[model samples]
Target: LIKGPWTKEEDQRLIKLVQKYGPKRWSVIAKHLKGRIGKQCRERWHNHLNPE
Candidate 1:
């Protein structure tokens, strides 16, 4: 995937994955989800998972 911000669909998928898996390691998550790097996954979770 390109180096940029995530989309709504991506956010949804990431949230769903986190909800299902319960905040596992980013490297594991990266391997599990397509089109997302571990760093991206971590950032997405930290920044946008909830409305802060």
Candidate 2:
């Protein structure tokens, strides 16, 4: 595991995936990413990037 902060590219990629898959599909979204788990992906969006 990298266990470090997300890069800008990674954040953008995550955002793109979120838009494509919708915010609730964390498991599927994380599968499309690297070095991230579903729960962590969800938390990052909710805690950091979620507009709602």
Candidate 3:
């Protein structure tokens, strides 16, 4: 796993991407973002976006 917390920019970007694209394959997002892995993106979105 990568170190350090996600920045606001990253958070915003992820949110915007998800909103615009809608729950796409994380592998595609991973490639699009150019730093994080698909699993990491999925985890972040799930933990942050998919609230209980």
Candidate 4:
């Protein structure tokens, strides 16, 4: 499916993942995100949810 608005659940998972693993682990977290790629996860976390 195409990308659009992010749900609270999605936000929580990504934020949690980034916080736990960090930006360097985007490749690994992307697998858990399913629909998104490592690039997307990196962009998202880097832009806002970086946890840094």
What is the C-alpha lDDT profile of model 2 across 1-52, one tens digit per residue?
6446878887888899999999899999998778888988888888878756
TM-score comparison, 2 vs 4, better candidate = 2
Ranking by TM-score: 2, 3, 4, 1
Task: Evaluate model 1: give its TM-score.
Answer: 0.69
Taking all chains together, the TM-score of candidate 2 against the true structure is 0.83
Q: What C-alpha lDDT do the candidate models reach, one value each?
A: 0.76, 0.84, 0.76, 0.78
* TM-score of decoy 3: 0.74
* Quality of model 4 by C-alpha lDDT: 0.78
For model 4, how does the per-residue alpha-carbon lDDT over 1-52 read when each residue is reduced to its tens digit? 4565666788799988977887797789988885787888787776766545
Worst 10 residues of 1 by lDDT: 1-10
Tell me the TM-score of each prediction against the true structure.
Answer: 0.69, 0.83, 0.74, 0.72
Clashing pairs in 2: none
Kindly list the per-residue Cα lDDT of model 1 for residues 1-52, writing each as its tens digit.
5547677887887788887766757777777667778888888888778645
The model with the greater lDDT, 1 or 4, is 4
Residue 25's C-alpha lDDT in candidate 1?
75
